[PDB]
Design a protein around this ligand. Structure first.
Ligand SMILES: *[C@@H]1O[C@H](CO)[C@@H](O[C@@H]2O[C@H](CO)[C@@H](O[C@@H]3O[C@H](CO[C@H]4O[C@H](CO)[C@@H](O)[C@H](O)[C@@H]4O)[C@@H](O)[C@H](O[C@H]4O[C@H](CO)[C@@H](O)[C@H](O)[C@@H]4O)[C@@H]3O)[C@H](O)[C@H]2NC(C)=O)[C@H](O)[C@H]1NC(C)=O
Ligand SMILES: *[C@@H]1O[C@H](CO)[C@@H](O[C@@H]2O[C@H](CO)[C@@H](O)[C@H](O)[C@H]2NC(C)=O)[C@H](O)[C@H]1NC(C)=O
Ligand SMILES: *[C@@H]1O[C@H](CO)[C@@H](O[C@@H]2O[C@H](CO)[C@@H](O)[C@H](O)[C@H]2NC(C)=O)[C@H](O)[C@H]1NC(C)=O
Ligand SMILES: *[C@@H]1O[C@H](CO)[C@@H](O[C@@H]2O[C@H](CO)[C@@H](O)[C@H](O)[C@H]2NC(C)=O)[C@H](O)[C@H]1NC(C)=O
Ligand SMILES: *[C@@H]1O[C@H](CO)[C@@H](O[C@@H]2O[C@H](CO)[C@@H](O)[C@H](O)[C@H]2NC(C)=O)[C@H](O)[C@H]1NC(C)=O
Ligand SMILES: *[C@@H]1O[C@H](CO)[C@@H](O)[C@H](O)[C@H]1NC(C)=O
Ligand SMILES: *[C@@H]1O[C@H](CO)[C@@H](O)[C@H](O)[C@H]1NC(C)=O
Lengths: 540, 522
C-alpha cells in the first residue's frame, strides 16, 4: 500500500490567523452568537452565506478589511407558532429555528430559498436585489430537510427542481424527488430497499440528457451491513409511468456502485463518499472529483478519485443485476431477458422515437426497471487508482474546490481539499500521457480567535468556494467564513530557490523586484511547475 | 476508532552482536534456546552460542554444524530454473527429540531432507530421512514442525511447485496422516504460522482464503487434531485425519460494526498467566489496505470450546453459510477423539462409522469464531508503516517474579515492550519502544534488511535475543541505567528499580503506579 507523500510546504495557524474572517457583522460598530452556517455559494460577484434564520451576503470585490462585513442581510425567522409546535413534538430549543438548507439561483432576478423552518420545511422566492420574498410560500416537504444536521440535494434544471432528502418528520422516507417546472412530480418508490437503502445524499449534477445523483447507501450486494458509494441517472424528460406501472414514479432511475480502489492482490475500496464536485472540463474531458473515506469504525483513511462523465453514462448501458433466488449472490441479467425498449433509456431516444413520453412505455419495460434499478458494473475511476491518498492522519478529507485555469497560461489544474479538522490540502493534477497528483501545500486555516466563541469549537469545513477574480478561496465553518489567498507567494520573500521549488502555478519569481510574487496580468515571471529545478540556486 | 498509545519511554549500537565468528551472509532462518544453548539456524549451517559465557561486545559461536547440499542437488536445482542464491540448504526445522538427538531438516536446494544429529558433537547420526511434507523446498516459505509423543507434526507444501499445502504427521511408530489433497474445504492457500501441544490435541494456527466470505478475503484460523488419530476406515479417509476441524479467530475492535484484524503474523506457545493457559497473537490488516496491527489474546478453554459448537454448511450451492442443526450431526460426534467421553466403544478412529467420517470430510469448518479474552485487542498500533510480528513473553518478570512483560518485534527492526495489566488480562501498558537494528554490524553490501526473524527471551541472562537475517542481537531485558529517582520509579518497568545505595536505577519500585509522590525533578 502507497506511502503518504509529503507536501512541499506547510502553513500553520501562526501565518493563517491573519486571513480576513466573516462572522456576520454589518460595518456599523462585542455581542457574539454562533451563526450556524449551513452552506456558501457565489453568484455573480456576491458571496451568499446560508445560516440559521438568515442569508448574509458579502460583496466580494469591495471587501478589503480584516473583518469581512455583511453587505446585505436576508432575515427569515420561523413563526412563533411553528417554534412552539416544534418544541411540543419534543425537539430542542437550538434546533427549532429556520435553518436555510436550499439556496438556488432560479434566474437573474430570483432566488429560490428553503429552510427547515423548525421541523416544518418551507420554500420561498426571493428577489435578488432586495432580498425580500414575493408570492405565495411553497410547501417544503420532499424539497428540504426538517433537521439542519441532515445532508440534502437541490438543483434546478430546465425549470424543474430536483431534490433529495426525507419527506417525513421521523426521517424514515428518504426520497429522490422532482417538482415544479410545469411537469409532473416524480418520486422514488416509497419503502423500496432496492431503490434506496438508507441513503445519505451528497451531490447532483446536470449533464446531457440526465441528472446524476451521488450518494451512499447500505449495499444490497452484501446482504453483513456494508455502505457503498453510488451514482444514479434519471432522464430529464421523464414523465412518470403508465396508469398500470410506476404511475407518479421515476421510469428512468438506475444506479451503480462507484469504484474508488487501490489495485492489489485483492482490491481495497474507499466506500464512504464525502463530496463530489460539479462537472469540470479538465484536459478535454468532462469529469467530477469525489472524496471517499473508510468507515468511521475502521482505521481512518481518505482518497480522491476522478470520474469521466463518459464512463458514468456508459455503466448504464451494461447489464443489470439480479438475485436469481433469495439469499444468493448477485449476478448479471443476460441481455436476452431485458425488455424492449431498454429500461432507463429516454423517450425520443434512438429507437424510442415512437414514445411521446414515458407514460407510453410498455408494462414489461416498466416492471423490469422497477425490480432492477441496480446495474451489475461499477464505474471505473480515471487511472484506476486514487489521484490522492491520506492514510496516516486522524482527519477525513471532505470538501473539494477545483481551479482548472491556474497560472500565466491558464493551463494548470489546482485542487483544494477541505477536512473535518480545518486543514486544507492543495495539490496539482498531473496531466496527459491525467496521471495522478503532486502535493503542493497543507495549511491550517481555522482561526480559534475569530471562530471559537459562544461555546463552539467546530473545525468542520462546511463549504469552499474558489473565486478567481478575488484571488481567493472562501472556506466556511459553522461560526465563520475565512478568506484564504490562493497562493502564499511572498511567504518565500526574496529566496528564489523556495519560490521556484514550490511548483505553485499561482507564484513566480520576479527579478525586477527581486521577490516571489503572484501572477500580475507587466514584468518577467519565472516558474518551473513541470520540474522543480533549483540547481545553481540557494539557499535558505 | 481508537487512537494509539505513546510509550512511557522511547544508544542501541552498544549491544552485543553475533555475526557467526569464532574467537580470534548467514541467512538466519530461526533462533531457539534449548537448555542453556542458543541455536542459530541458517544457510548450510547451525551455530550454537554459549549463553552463559558470552560477555564481549561480539558474541562468538561455540560449535558450528555444517550441512551443504551435495553438488548434484545444487546442479539439479539450477536446471529446474531456481537461482544460485536459493539452491542451498537452508535449515528450516530444528527439534530436540526424546532419545537426545537433534532432528534437523533443510531445504537442500529444493529437495527437502531431514537428519538426526548428536547434541554433544553435532555430527550426523544414522541415515538421511525423506523431507517431503516435513520441510519446505523454498527458504522464503513459512512452515511448522513440532514433536509430541514422538510423532512429528508438520505443515508445509509437499511439492516443488508449492501447490499441495498440507498438515501432516509421521514417525512415532504411528500411521502417517494428511489433510485431503486438493480439498479447498480443508485448506485454501494456507499460510502456516504456529502449532501448540495442549491436552488431547495439537492446535494449528494459520491463515487462508475464507470460504465463508466469498472477493478473496483472508481469515485467521485455529485448527485441532487429535493426538491419537489413526486415520479413517477402509472406505472413508483411509489415510487422512479424522479429527481435523478449524474455526475463524476473532480479533476485532468492539462496537455496533466490528473491525477485524485478519492477517495472522505470529502466535506464542501456550503460557500460564494468572491461572489461565493462553496464547498471544499478532495480526495486521491486508498489505494493500490502510496499515494497522493488533495483538489479541486467547484462552485455551475458549479454543477448545468452539470445536464443541455447531458446524458450518452451505445448505445449497453459492448460498450463505449457516450452522448445521445438532439433530444432523452423527454419533460419534465428528472430531471427538476415540476413547473419549462417549467413545469408549471405539479403540481407534479406524473403527469410526462411515457416517461421521463422511460428515467430517465435508464439514471441517465450525460456524463460530473464537473470541479474544476481553473481546477486544490487547494492544493496537495504527499510525505507522511497520507491522507487529514476532512475540516474546516473560510471565515471571521482576523481583517478585509476579509480572508479565510482552515484547513485540516488527518487520522494521523496532521492538515494543509492554506490561500486561491484570484485571480484578485487563489490557496493556505501553512501557517502551526501542530500535535495535545495528546497521554497522548487521548491514551487508549496502543493504539493510531490518526484518526480525525471531526473538528468544532468556530470564537467566537478562537478555532478549533478536535475530535478523544477518545477525543476532543480545538485548538487555531492562535498560535500567538509561533513566534520577523519579524517572526510574515512573517507568513502571519490572526489570528496573531504585537503589539509593548507589543513588541509581539498577537491575525500591512501584510498578502498579507511577507514584512519584514527593520526588523529582529532572
Ligand atoms: C482496566 O484498566 C483501567 C485502568 O488502566 C481501569 O479503568 C479505571 O478504573 C479506575 C478504578 O475505578 C477508575 O479510577 C477513577 O478515576 C476517577 C478520575 O477520572 C478518571 O477517569 C476518567 C474517564 O472516566 C479519565 O478521564 C481520568 O483521566 C481518570 O482516569 C476518580 O474520580 C476516581 O476516584 C474517586 O473514587 C475513589 C474510590 O473509588 C476515591 O478513593 C477517590 O477519592 C475519588 O473520589 C477513581 O479513582 C477510572 O475511572 C477507570 N477508567 C479509566 C480510563 O481510568 C479499569 O477499571 C480496569 N478494569 C479492571 C480493573 O478490571
Ligand atoms: C475497480 O476498478 C479496478 C481498476 O480497474 C478493477 O480492477 C481490475 O480488475 C480485474 C480483475 O478483477 C483485472 O483483470 C484488471 O487488470 C484490474 N485493473 C485494471 C488496471 O483495470 C476492479 O475490478 C474494479 N472493481 C469492481 C468491483 O468493478
Ligand atoms: C501551459 O501553457 C504553456 C503555454 O506557453 C506551455 O508552455 C510552453 O509549452 C511549449 C510546448 O507546447 C514549450 O515548447 C514552451 O517552451 C513552453 N513555454 C514556456 C512557458 O516556457 C506549457 O507546456 C503548458 N503546460 C501544461 C499544458 O501543463
Ligand atoms: C534440558 O535437557 C533435558 C534433557 O536433556 C530436558 O529434559 C526434561 O527433563 C525433565 C525431567 O526428566 C522432564 O520432566 C521434562 O519433560 C524434560 N523436558 C521437558 C520440560 O519437557 C529439559 O527439558 C531441558 N531443559 C532444561 C532447561 O533443563
Ligand atoms: C467477535 O467478537 C465480538 C466481541 O465478542 C463479537 O461482538 C458481539 O457481537 C454481537 C452480535 O453482533 C453483539 O450483539 C455483541 O454486543 C458483541 N459484543 C459482545 C461480546 O457482546 C462479534 O460478534 C464476534 N464476531 C464474530 C464473527 O463472531
Ligand atoms: C453582476 O454584477 C456585476 C458587477 O459586479 C454587474 O455589472 C452586473 O450587472 C450583475 N449582473 C447581474 C445582476 O446578473
Ligand atoms: C508482586 O509481589 C509483591 C510482593 O511480593 C506485591 O506487593 C505485589 O502486589 C505483587 N504484584 C502483583 C501480584 O501483580
Amino acid at each position: 500500500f502507497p506511502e503518504d507523500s509529503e507536501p512541499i510546504s506547510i502553513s500553520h495557524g501562526n501565518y493563517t490567523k491573519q486571513y480576513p474572517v466573516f462572522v456576520g457583522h454589518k460595518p456599523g460598530r462585542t455581542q457574539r452568537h454562533r451563526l450556524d452556517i449551513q452552506m456558501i455559494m457565489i453568484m455573480n460577484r456576491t458571496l451568499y452565506v446560508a445560516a440559521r434564520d438568515h442569508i448574509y451576503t458579502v460583496d466580494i470585490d469591495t471587501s478589503h478589511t480584516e473583518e469581512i462585513y455583511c453587505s446585505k442581510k436576508l432575515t427569515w425567522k420561523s413563526r412563533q407558532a411553528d417554534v412552539d409546535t416544534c418544541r411540543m413534538k419534543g425537539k430542542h430549543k437550538d434546533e427549532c429555528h429556520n435553518f436555510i438548507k436550499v439556496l438556488l439561483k432560479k434566474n437573474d432576478d430570483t432566488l429560490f430559498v428553503c429552510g427547515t423552518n423548525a421541523f416544518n420545511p418551507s420554500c420561498r422566492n426571493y428577489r435578488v436585489d432586495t432580498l425580500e420574498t414575493f408570492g405565495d410560500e411553497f410547501s417544503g416537504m420532499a424539497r428540504c430537510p426538517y433537521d439542519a444536521k441532515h445532508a440534502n440535494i437541490a438543483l434546478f434544471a430546465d425549470g424543474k427542481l430536483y431534490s433529495a432528502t426525507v419527506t417525513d418528520f421521523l426521517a424514515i422516507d428518504a426520497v429522490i424527488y422532482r417538482s415544479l417546472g410545469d411537469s409532473p412530480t416524480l418520486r422514488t418508490v416509497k419503502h423500496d430497499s432496492k431503490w434506496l437503502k438508507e441513503p445519505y445524499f451528497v451531490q447532483a449534477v446536470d449533464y446531457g440528457d440526465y441528472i446524476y445523483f451521488f450518494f451512499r447507501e447500505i449495499a444490497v450486494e452484501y446482504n453483513g451491513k456494508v455502505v457503498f458509494p453510488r451514482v444514479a441517472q434519471v432522464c430529464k424528460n421523464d414523465m412518470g409511468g403508465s396508469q398500470r406501472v410506476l404511475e407518479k414514479q421515476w421510469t428512468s432511475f438506475l444506479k451503480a456502485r462507484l469504484n474508488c480502489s487501490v489495485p492489489g492482490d485483492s482490491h481495497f475500496y474507499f466506500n464512504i463518499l464525502q463530496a463530489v464536485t460539479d462537472v469540470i472540463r479538465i484536459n478535454g474531458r468532462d469529469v467530477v472529483l469525489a472524496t471517499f473515506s473508510t468507515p468511521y469504525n475502521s482505521i481512518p483513511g481518505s482518497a480522491v478519485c476522478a470520474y469521466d462523465m463518459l464512463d458514468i453514462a456508459n455503466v448504464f448501458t451494461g447489464r443489470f443485476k439480479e438475485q436469481k433466488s433469495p439469499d444468493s449472490t448477485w449476478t448479471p441479467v443476460p441481455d436476452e431477458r431485458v425488455p424492449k425498449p431498454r429500461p432507463g433509456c429516454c423517450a425520443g431516444s434512438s429507437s424510442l422515437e415512437k414514445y411521446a413520453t414515458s407514460n407510453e412505455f410498455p408494462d414489461d419495460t416498466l416492471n423490469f426497471i422497477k425490480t432492477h434499478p441496480l446495474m451489475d458494473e461499477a464505474v471505473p475511476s480515471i487511472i484506476n487508482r486514487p489521484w490522492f491518498l491520506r492514510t496516516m492522519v486522524r482527519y477525513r478529507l471532505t470538501k473539494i474546490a477545483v481551479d482548472n485555469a491556474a497560472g500565466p497560461y491558464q493551463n494548470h489544474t489546482v485542487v483544494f481539499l477541505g477536512s473535518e479538522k480545518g486543514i486544507i490540502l492543495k495539490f496539482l493534477a498531473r496531466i496527459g500521457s491525467l496521471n495522478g497528483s503532486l502535493f503542493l501545500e497543507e495549511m491550517n486555516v481555522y482561526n480559534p480567535e475569530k471562530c471559537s466563541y459562544d461555546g463552539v469549537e467546530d473545525k468542520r469545513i462546511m463549504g469552499m468556494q474558489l473565486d478567481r477574480a478575488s484571488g481567493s478561496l472562501y472556506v466556511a465553518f459553522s461560526t465563520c467564513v475565512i478568506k484564504v489567498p490562493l497562493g502564499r507567494c511572498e511567504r518565500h520573500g526574496k529566496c528564489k530557490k523556495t519560490c521556484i521549488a514550490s511548483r505553485d502555478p499561482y507564484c513566480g519569481w520576479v527579478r525586477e523586484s527581486g521577490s516571489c510574487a503572484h501572477l500580475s496580468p507587466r514584468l518577467t515571471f519565472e516558474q518551473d511547475i513541470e520540474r522543480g529545478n533549483t540547481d545553481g540556486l540557494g539557499d535558505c
